[PDB]
Amino acid sequence: DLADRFAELERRYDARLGVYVPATGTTAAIEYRADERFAFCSTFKAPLVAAVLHQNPLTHLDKLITYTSDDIRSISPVAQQHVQTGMTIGQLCDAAIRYSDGTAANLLLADLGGPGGGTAAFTGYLRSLGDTVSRLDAEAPELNRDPPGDERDTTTPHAIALVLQQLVLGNALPPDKRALLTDWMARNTTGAKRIRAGFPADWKVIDKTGTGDYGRANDIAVVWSPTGVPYVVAVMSDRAGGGYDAEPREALLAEAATCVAGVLA
C-alpha cells in the first residue's frame, strides 16, 4: 500500500515524489517513480568527491588549490573565507559535502578536468559504476536551474541509490578512501530537516542534500538500523506546476522517509 501513501503525500504537498530503496538479502526494493528523471541539484557532490578520491592518491588531498573572488559563483559558505589562502583538495571535498559548497564543487569538477569544466569526466565516472542514466552538463548554480523536461543535469532515484550503495557499502572505493567519504556524509550539516527527520534518532543517517528551483528538494542517504543493518535511501521531489519560483518542501522528504522507516522496521 506504499504507492498509495506516497501518492497521498504528492497530493498533500502538491509535489512530484521519487523514492528508491535498493533490495537487501531480506527486503524488497522500494520504488515510486524510481525511474523518472529528477534534477541532481547538489546531490551530485557526493559521487563527485568519490570521483576525485578514486582518480588520485591520498596525497592528492593535500594539494592546495588557489582561486579568486570571481571563482565562487553560487552558495559558498566556506570558500568565501579562504580566497586569500586557498583550499586543499581535501578541504574542498569536506566543504562540498558537509556544507554543499558550490564553489568547492566547481573546483573539484575542474580537478577532474576535460570538457564542460569537468562535467563530462564526472559523468564518465558514473558510467564506471554502471550508471548509464545520469548526466551532469553544467556547474553551480546553473545545474539547479534547468527547465522541467530537460534531460540535462538529471538522475533518477533508482540510479543515484545504486551509485551511493557502491560508494559506501560496496567496493567502489578502497577502505581508506571509503572512510573519508562516509565520514564527510556522516557529519553533513544540511540534512537535518529531511531524511534525518524521518528516521528515529537511534538510526544512524549519513546524507547529501539537493535543493533547487521549480520546488526541487532532494536527499540521498545511507541508514543503519539500531542493530546495524544498512539501507540506501534516495528521495527526490519537485513542484514544476508552480513554475520557477515554486517553493521546495522539506517536510515532504521527512514524511516519505518516515513511511520508508516504517517498512524497514
Side-chain angles (χ1 to χ4, degrees), residues 2-72 74-203 205-265:
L2 225 52
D4 287 338
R5 290 281 303 110
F6 291 142
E8 202 298 305
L9 294 179
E10 288 187 313
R11 326 164 243 274
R12 180 177 299 157
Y13 291 94
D14 195 21
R16 185 178 57 122
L17 175 69
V19 178
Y20 194 76
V21 176
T24 66
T26 65
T27 59
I30 300 171
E31 54 196 32
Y32 189 83
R33 309 191 187 278
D35 296 312
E36 298 192 16
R37 295 188 170 278
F38 292 78
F40 268 114
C41 302
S42 290
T43 63
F44 89 100
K45 299 168 179 162
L48 171 66
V49 170
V52 171
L53 288 174
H54 174 251
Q55 304 188 352
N56 300 275
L58 258 201
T59 68
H60 193 59
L61 300 171
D62 306 283
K63 188 152 144 160
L64 186 78
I65 302 301
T66 64
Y67 57 97
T68 63
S69 267
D70 295 5
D71 289 319
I72 56 218
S74 179
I75 80 184
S76 296
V78 183
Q80 204 86 34
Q81 297 201 23
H82 296 94
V83 163
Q84 235 68 45
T85 95
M87 286 174 73
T88 64
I89 289 290
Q91 284 167 342
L92 290 172
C93 290
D94 189 307
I97 291 173
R98 303 202 310 112
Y99 290 94
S100 203
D101 188 301
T103 299
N106 286 356
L107 292 170
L108 294 168
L109 279 169
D111 193 62
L112 289 179
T119 58
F122 172 83
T123 303
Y125 179 70
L126 297 181
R127 296 287 183 271
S128 85
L129 301 177
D131 180 355
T132 59
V133 171
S134 307
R135 48 183 296 185
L136 188 70
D137 296 276
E139 4 181 345
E142 290 74 25
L143 67 86
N144 305 298
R145 301 170 180 187
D146 309 336
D150 200 351
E151 294 213 358
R152 284 177 303 111
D153 308 307
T154 56
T155 180
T156 66
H158 193 174
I160 194 156
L162 293 179
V163 166
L164 187 62
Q165 184 167 63
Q166 292 175 85
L167 296 178
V168 175
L169 301 175
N171 302 292
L173 294 166
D176 55 5
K177 289 177 180 175
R178 182 185 322 145
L180 298 184
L181 174 68
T182 302
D183 169 67
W184 286 316
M185 290 182 71
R187 299 181 304 107
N188 178 39
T189 69
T190 71
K193 296 291 168 185
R194 299 182 190 196
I195 287 163
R196 176 71 274 188
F199 280 78
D202 61 27
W203 287 68
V205 176
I206 76 176
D207 84 297
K208 175 79 204 69
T209 58
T211 306
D213 294 294
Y214 304 94
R216 286 166 177 145
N218 306 323
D219 196 15
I220 60 171
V222 187
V223 305
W224 283 261
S225 79
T227 54
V229 181
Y231 301 89
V232 176
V233 185
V235 175
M236 309 187 78
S237 77
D238 64 334
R239 300 177 71 231
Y244 189 98
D245 294 348
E247 305 179 289
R249 294 293 187 60
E250 20 181 46
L252 203 216
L253 307 190
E255 285 322 75
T258 304
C259 294
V260 170
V263 168
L264 299 183

mmCIF file of all heavy atoms in Angstrom, residues 2-35:
data_model
loop_
_atom_site.group_PDB
_atom_site.id
_atom_site.type_symbol
_atom_site.label_atom_id
_atom_site.label_comp_id
_atom_site.label_asym_id
_atom_site.label_seq_id
_atom_site.Cartn_x
_atom_site.Cartn_y
_atom_site.Cartn_z
ATOM 1 N N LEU A 2 2.167 1.075 -0.241
ATOM 2 C CA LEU A 2 3.124 2.171 -0.137
ATOM 3 C C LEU A 2 2.918 3.197 -1.236
ATOM 4 O O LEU A 2 3.032 4.398 -1.006
ATOM 5 C CB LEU A 2 4.565 1.658 -0.098
ATOM 6 C CG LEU A 2 5.462 2.311 0.962
ATOM 7 C CD1 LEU A 2 4.810 2.247 2.329
ATOM 8 C CD2 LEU A 2 6.832 1.660 0.984
ATOM 9 N N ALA A 3 2.603 2.708 -2.429
ATOM 10 C CA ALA A 3 2.308 3.565 -3.563
ATOM 11 C C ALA A 3 1.203 4.555 -3.205
ATOM 12 O O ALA A 3 1.272 5.740 -3.551
ATOM 13 C CB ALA A 3 1.922 2.736 -4.768
ATOM 14 N N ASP A 4 0.190 4.057 -2.507
ATOM 15 C CA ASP A 4 -0.940 4.878 -2.099
ATOM 16 C C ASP A 4 -0.510 5.936 -1.097
ATOM 17 O O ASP A 4 -0.985 7.069 -1.148
ATOM 18 C CB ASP A 4 -2.052 4.008 -1.502
ATOM 19 C CG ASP A 4 -2.789 3.208 -2.554
ATOM 20 O OD1 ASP A 4 -2.746 3.601 -3.741
ATOM 21 O OD2 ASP A 4 -3.411 2.186 -2.200
ATOM 22 N N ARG A 5 0.384 5.566 -0.183
ATOM 23 C CA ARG A 5 0.851 6.506 0.826
ATOM 24 C C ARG A 5 1.707 7.600 0.193
ATOM 25 O O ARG A 5 1.605 8.771 0.561
ATOM 26 C CB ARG A 5 1.627 5.783 1.924
ATOM 27 C CG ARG A 5 0.783 4.895 2.820
ATOM 28 C CD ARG A 5 0.032 5.700 3.862
ATOM 29 N NE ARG A 5 0.925 6.511 4.687
ATOM 30 C CZ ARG A 5 0.996 7.838 4.621
ATOM 31 N NH1 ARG A 5 0.231 8.507 3.761
ATOM 32 N NH2 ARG A 5 1.834 8.500 5.414
ATOM 33 N N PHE A 6 2.551 7.220 -0.764
ATOM 34 C CA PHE A 6 3.343 8.201 -1.491
ATOM 35 C C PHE A 6 2.474 9.132 -2.330
ATOM 36 O O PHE A 6 2.733 10.333 -2.403
ATOM 37 C CB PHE A 6 4.370 7.503 -2.388
ATOM 38 C CG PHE A 6 5.464 6.807 -1.633
ATOM 39 C CD1 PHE A 6 5.965 5.596 -2.073
ATOM 40 C CD2 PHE A 6 6.024 7.388 -0.509
ATOM 41 C CE1 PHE A 6 6.978 4.961 -1.392
ATOM 42 C CE2 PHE A 6 7.040 6.761 0.173
ATOM 43 C CZ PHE A 6 7.520 5.541 -0.269
ATOM 44 N N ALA A 7 1.446 8.572 -2.963
ATOM 45 C CA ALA A 7 0.501 9.367 -3.750
ATOM 46 C C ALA A 7 -0.252 10.410 -2.928
ATOM 47 O O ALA A 7 -0.505 11.519 -3.396
ATOM 48 C CB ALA A 7 -0.475 8.456 -4.474
ATOM 49 N N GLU A 8 -0.628 10.034 -1.709
ATOM 50 C CA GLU A 8 -1.308 10.945 -0.796
ATOM 51 C C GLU A 8 -0.396 12.112 -0.443
ATOM 52 O O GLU A 8 -0.830 13.262 -0.392
ATOM 53 C CB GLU A 8 -1.734 10.211 0.475
ATOM 54 C CG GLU A 8 -2.865 10.885 1.234
ATOM 55 C CD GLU A 8 -2.492 12.268 1.732
ATOM 56 O OE1 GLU A 8 -1.472 12.391 2.439
ATOM 57 O OE2 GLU A 8 -3.221 13.232 1.416
ATOM 58 N N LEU A 9 0.875 11.805 -0.210
ATOM 59 C CA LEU A 9 1.887 12.832 0.031
ATOM 60 C C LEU A 9 2.027 13.788 -1.146
ATOM 61 O O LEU A 9 2.124 15.000 -0.955
ATOM 62 C CB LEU A 9 3.230 12.201 0.397
ATOM 63 C CG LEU A 9 3.291 11.437 1.717
ATOM 64 C CD1 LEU A 9 4.683 10.858 1.929
ATOM 65 C CD2 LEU A 9 2.914 12.348 2.865
ATOM 66 N N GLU A 10 2.048 13.244 -2.359
ATOM 67 C CA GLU A 10 2.091 14.093 -3.545
ATOM 68 C C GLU A 10 0.911 15.056 -3.528
ATOM 69 O O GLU A 10 1.088 16.246 -3.805
ATOM 70 C CB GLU A 10 2.075 13.244 -4.820
ATOM 71 C CG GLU A 10 3.374 12.501 -5.057
ATOM 72 C CD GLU A 10 3.417 11.792 -6.393
ATOM 73 O OE1 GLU A 10 2.431 11.106 -6.741
ATOM 74 O OE2 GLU A 10 4.451 11.910 -7.094
ATOM 75 N N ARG A 11 -0.289 14.563 -3.212
ATOM 76 C CA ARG A 11 -1.443 15.469 -3.163
ATOM 77 C C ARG A 11 -1.323 16.459 -2.006
ATOM 78 O O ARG A 11 -1.653 17.637 -2.141
ATOM 79 C CB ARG A 11 -2.820 14.783 -3.180
ATOM 80 C CG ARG A 11 -2.964 13.499 -3.977
ATOM 81 C CD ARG A 11 -4.257 12.787 -3.536
ATOM 82 N NE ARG A 11 -4.050 11.475 -2.914
ATOM 83 C CZ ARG A 11 -3.932 10.336 -3.593
ATOM 84 N NH1 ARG A 11 -3.984 10.342 -4.920
ATOM 85 N NH2 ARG A 11 -3.753 9.191 -2.943
ATOM 86 N N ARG A 12 -0.858 15.960 -0.864
ATOM 87 C CA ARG A 12 -0.718 16.789 0.325
ATOM 88 C C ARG A 12 0.216 17.967 0.100
ATOM 89 O O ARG A 12 -0.068 19.093 0.512
ATOM 90 C CB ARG A 12 -0.196 15.948 1.486
ATOM 91 C CG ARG A 12 -0.015 16.731 2.781
ATOM 92 C CD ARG A 12 0.444 15.848 3.930
ATOM 93 N NE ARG A 12 -0.467 14.775 4.284
ATOM 94 C CZ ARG A 12 -0.072 13.671 4.919
ATOM 95 N NH1 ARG A 12 1.198 13.529 5.271
ATOM 96 N NH2 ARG A 12 -0.942 12.710 5.220
ATOM 97 N N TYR A 13 1.341 17.694 -0.556
ATOM 98 C CA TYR A 13 2.370 18.705 -0.745
ATOM 99 C C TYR A 13 2.388 19.330 -2.133
ATOM 100 O O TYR A 13 3.284 20.110 -2.452
ATOM 101 C CB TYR A 13 3.738 18.110 -0.410
ATOM 102 C CG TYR A 13 3.914 17.815 1.058
ATOM 103 C CD1 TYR A 13 3.633 16.555 1.572
ATOM 104 C CD2 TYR A 13 4.341 18.800 1.935
ATOM 105 C CE1 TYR A 13 3.780 16.284 2.917
ATOM 106 C CE2 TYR A 13 4.499 18.539 3.279
ATOM 107 C CZ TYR A 13 4.212 17.280 3.765
ATOM 108 O OH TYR A 13 4.368 17.021 5.106
ATOM 109 N N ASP A 14 1.382 19.013 -2.946
ATOM 110 C CA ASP A 14 1.361 19.451 -4.339
ATOM 111 C C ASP A 14 2.731 19.270 -4.989
ATOM 112 O O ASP A 14 3.340 20.222 -5.463
ATOM 113 C CB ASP A 14 0.934 20.915 -4.409
ATOM 114 C CG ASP A 14 0.536 21.334 -5.803
ATOM 115 O OD1 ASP A 14 0.202 20.447 -6.623
ATOM 116 O OD2 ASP A 14 0.559 22.553 -6.075
ATOM 117 N N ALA A 15 3.203 18.030 -4.998
ATOM 118 C CA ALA A 15 4.578 17.721 -5.367
ATOM 119 C C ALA A 15 4.657 16.489 -6.251
ATOM 120 O O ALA A 15 3.692 15.728 -6.365
ATOM 121 C CB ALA A 15 5.410 17.500 -4.119
ATOM 122 N N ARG A 16 5.812 16.302 -6.879
ATOM 123 C CA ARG A 16 6.113 15.027 -7.515
ATOM 124 C C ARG A 16 7.216 14.407 -6.673
ATOM 125 O O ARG A 16 8.201 15.068 -6.345
ATOM 126 C CB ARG A 16 6.616 15.223 -8.941
ATOM 127 C CG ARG A 16 6.834 13.910 -9.679
ATOM 128 C CD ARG A 16 7.285 14.124 -11.120
ATOM 129 N NE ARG A 16 8.508 14.920 -11.217
ATOM 130 C CZ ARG A 16 9.626 14.494 -11.801
ATOM 131 N NH1 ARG A 16 9.675 13.282 -12.349
ATOM 132 N NH2 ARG A 16 10.697 15.282 -11.857
ATOM 133 N N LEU A 17 7.041 13.137 -6.328
ATOM 134 C CA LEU A 17 7.958 12.457 -5.427
ATOM 135 C C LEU A 17 8.562 11.217 -6.064
ATOM 136 O O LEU A 17 7.868 10.446 -6.730
ATOM 137 C CB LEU A 17 7.225 12.060 -4.150
ATOM 138 C CG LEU A 17 7.973 11.218 -3.112
ATOM 139 C CD1 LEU A 17 9.085 12.014 -2.449
ATOM 140 C CD2 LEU A 17 7.002 10.691 -2.063
ATOM 141 N N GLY A 18 9.862 11.042 -5.867
ATOM 142 C CA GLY A 18 10.540 9.852 -6.339
ATOM 143 C C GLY A 18 11.289 9.200 -5.193
ATOM 144 O O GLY A 18 11.953 9.874 -4.400
ATOM 145 N N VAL A 19 11.156 7.882 -5.089
ATOM 146 C CA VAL A 19 11.748 7.138 -3.992
ATOM 147 C C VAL A 19 12.377 5.849 -4.483
ATOM 148 O O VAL A 19 11.774 5.121 -5.275
ATOM 149 C CB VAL A 19 10.688 6.781 -2.931
ATOM 150 C CG1 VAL A 19 11.315 5.969 -1.811
ATOM 151 C CG2 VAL A 19 10.030 8.036 -2.386
ATOM 152 N N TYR A 20 13.598 5.573 -4.040
ATOM 153 C CA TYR A 20 14.158 4.253 -4.239
ATOM 154 C C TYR A 20 14.962 3.791 -3.038
ATOM 155 O O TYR A 20 15.791 4.536 -2.504
ATOM 156 C CB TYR A 20 15.049 4.201 -5.477
ATOM 157 C CG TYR A 20 15.369 2.784 -5.909
ATOM 158 C CD1 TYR A 20 14.426 2.013 -6.575
ATOM 159 C CD2 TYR A 20 16.597 2.209 -5.619
ATOM 160 C CE1 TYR A 20 14.706 0.726 -6.966
ATOM 161 C CE2 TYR A 20 16.890 0.917 -6.013
ATOM 162 C CZ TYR A 20 15.942 0.184 -6.686
ATOM 163 O OH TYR A 20 16.225 -1.098 -7.077
ATOM 164 N N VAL A 21 14.705 2.552 -2.631
ATOM 165 C CA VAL A 21 15.476 1.869 -1.601
ATOM 166 C C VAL A 21 15.855 0.530 -2.201
ATOM 167 O O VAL A 21 14.985 -0.305 -2.452
ATOM 168 C CB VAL A 21 14.664 1.637 -0.330
ATOM 169 C CG1 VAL A 21 15.476 0.827 0.668
ATOM 170 C CG2 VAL A 21 14.232 2.965 0.269
ATOM 171 N N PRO A 22 17.147 0.324 -2.459
ATOM 172 C CA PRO A 22 17.571 -0.947 -3.049
ATOM 173 C C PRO A 22 17.188 -2.144 -2.199
ATOM 174 O O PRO A 22 17.096 -2.052 -0.973
ATOM 175 C CB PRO A 22 19.099 -0.804 -3.110
ATOM 176 C CG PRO A 22 19.324 0.673 -3.168
ATOM 177 C CD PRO A 22 18.282 1.240 -2.261
ATOM 178 N N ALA A 23 16.960 -3.266 -2.871
ATOM 179 C CA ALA A 23 16.751 -4.542 -2.214
ATOM 180 C C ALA A 23 17.939 -4.953 -1.359
ATOM 181 O O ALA A 23 19.086 -4.613 -1.645
ATOM 182 C CB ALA A 23 16.491 -5.611 -3.254
ATOM 183 N N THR A 24 17.642 -5.682 -0.292
ATOM 184 C CA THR A 24 18.666 -6.325 0.518
ATOM 185 C C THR A 24 18.370 -7.814 0.527
ATOM 186 O O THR A 24 17.404 -8.266 -0.085
ATOM 187 C CB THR A 24 18.666 -5.802 1.958
ATOM 188 O OG1 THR A 24 17.446 -6.194 2.603
ATOM 189 C CG2 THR A 24 18.763 -4.285 1.970
ATOM 190 N N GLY A 25 19.203 -8.582 1.214
ATOM 191 C CA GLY A 25 19.020 -10.020 1.261
ATOM 192 C C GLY A 25 17.721 -10.419 1.936
ATOM 193 O O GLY A 25 17.245 -11.539 1.770
ATOM 194 N N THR A 26 17.136 -9.491 2.687
ATOM 195 C CA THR A 26 15.903 -9.767 3.414
ATOM 196 C C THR A 26 14.755 -8.818 3.083
ATOM 197 O O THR A 26 13.650 -8.976 3.597
ATOM 198 C CB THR A 26 16.137 -9.714 4.931
ATOM 199 O OG1 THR A 26 16.490 -8.381 5.318
ATOM 200 C CG2 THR A 26 17.256 -10.661 5.325
ATOM 201 N N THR A 27 15.007 -7.832 2.227
ATOM 202 C CA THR A 27 13.949 -6.893 1.863
ATOM 203 C C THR A 27 13.868 -6.598 0.371
ATOM 204 O O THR A 27 14.879 -6.611 -0.346
ATOM 205 C CB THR A 27 14.096 -5.560 2.625
ATOM 206 O OG1 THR A 27 15.377 -4.980 2.325
ATOM 207 C CG2 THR A 27 14.003 -5.792 4.119
ATOM 208 N N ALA A 28 12.650 -6.334 -0.082
ATOM 209 C CA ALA A 28 12.384 -5.978 -1.466
ATOM 210 C C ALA A 28 12.739 -4.516 -1.692
ATOM 211 O O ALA A 28 12.717 -3.712 -0.758
ATOM 212 C CB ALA A 28 10.922 -6.201 -1.789
ATOM 213 N N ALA A 29 13.075 -4.181 -2.932
ATOM 214 C CA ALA A 29 13.257 -2.790 -3.312
ATOM 215 C C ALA A 29 11.990 -1.995 -3.036
ATOM 216 O O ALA A 29 10.882 -2.505 -3.196
ATOM 217 C CB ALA A 29 13.640 -2.688 -4.774
ATOM 218 N N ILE A 30 12.157 -0.745 -2.627
ATOM 219 C CA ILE A 30 11.037 0.187 -2.581
ATOM 220 C C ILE A 30 11.164 1.179 -3.717
ATOM 221 O O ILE A 30 12.199 1.844 -3.858
ATOM 222 C CB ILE A 30 11.020 0.949 -1.260
ATOM 223 C CG1 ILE A 30 10.886 -0.027 -0.083
ATOM 224 C CG2 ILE A 30 9.897 1.980 -1.255
ATOM 225 C CD1 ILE A 30 11.081 0.629 1.258
ATOM 226 N N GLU A 31 10.124 1.283 -4.535
ATOM 227 C CA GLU A 31 10.174 2.189 -5.668
ATOM 228 C C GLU A 31 8.886 2.971 -5.894
ATOM 229 O O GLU A 31 7.783 2.433 -5.798
ATOM 230 C CB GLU A 31 10.547 1.425 -6.933
ATOM 231 C CG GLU A 31 9.650 0.242 -7.222
ATOM 232 C CD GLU A 31 10.270 -0.710 -8.230
ATOM 233 O OE1 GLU A 31 11.518 -0.835 -8.242
ATOM 234 O OE2 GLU A 31 9.513 -1.326 -9.011
ATOM 235 N N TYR A 32 9.057 4.250 -6.204
ATOM 236 C CA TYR A 32 7.970 5.135 -6.589
ATOM 237 C C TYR A 32 8.547 6.181 -7.526
ATOM 238 O O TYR A 32 9.366 7.005 -7.121
ATOM 239 C CB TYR A 32 7.337 5.786 -5.355
ATOM 240 C CG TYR A 32 6.070 6.544 -5.660
ATOM 241 C CD1 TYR A 32 4.851 5.886 -5.761
ATOM 242 C CD2 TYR A 32 6.098 7.918 -5.881
ATOM 243 C CE1 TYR A 32 3.690 6.580 -6.049
ATOM 244 C CE2 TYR A 32 4.942 8.616 -6.152
ATOM 245 C CZ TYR A 32 3.742 7.938 -6.238
ATOM 246 O OH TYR A 32 2.584 8.629 -6.530
ATOM 247 N N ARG A 33 8.095 6.159 -8.773
ATOM 248 C CA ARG A 33 8.678 6.979 -9.830
ATOM 249 C C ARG A 33 10.194 6.859 -9.832
ATOM 250 O O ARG A 33 10.901 7.819 -10.142
ATOM 251 C CB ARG A 33 8.259 8.443 -9.683
ATOM 252 C CG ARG A 33 6.764 8.665 -9.543
ATOM 253 C CD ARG A 33 6.426 10.143 -9.676
ATOM 254 N NE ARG A 33 5.026 10.414 -9.395
ATOM 255 C CZ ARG A 33 4.039 10.250 -10.273
ATOM 256 N NH1 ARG A 33 4.300 9.790 -11.484
ATOM 257 N NH2 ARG A 33 2.786 10.536 -9.935
ATOM 258 N N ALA A 34 10.691 5.670 -9.497
ATOM 259 C CA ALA A 34 12.122 5.483 -9.279
ATOM 260 C C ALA A 34 12.934 5.638 -10.558
ATOM 261 O O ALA A 34 14.145 5.886 -10.509
ATOM 262 C CB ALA A 34 12.389 4.139 -8.629
ATOM 263 N N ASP A 35 12.262 5.498 -11.696
ATOM 264 C CA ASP A 35 12.921 5.622 -12.993
ATOM 265 C C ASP A 35 12.601 6.909 -13.734
ATOM 266 O O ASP A 35 12.983 7.079 -14.893
ATOM 267 C CB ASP A 35 12.660 4.383 -13.853
ATOM 268 C CG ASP A 35 13.256 3.125 -13.246
ATOM 269 O OD1 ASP A 35 14.442 3.159 -12.853
ATOM 270 O OD2 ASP A 35 12.538 2.107 -13.144
#
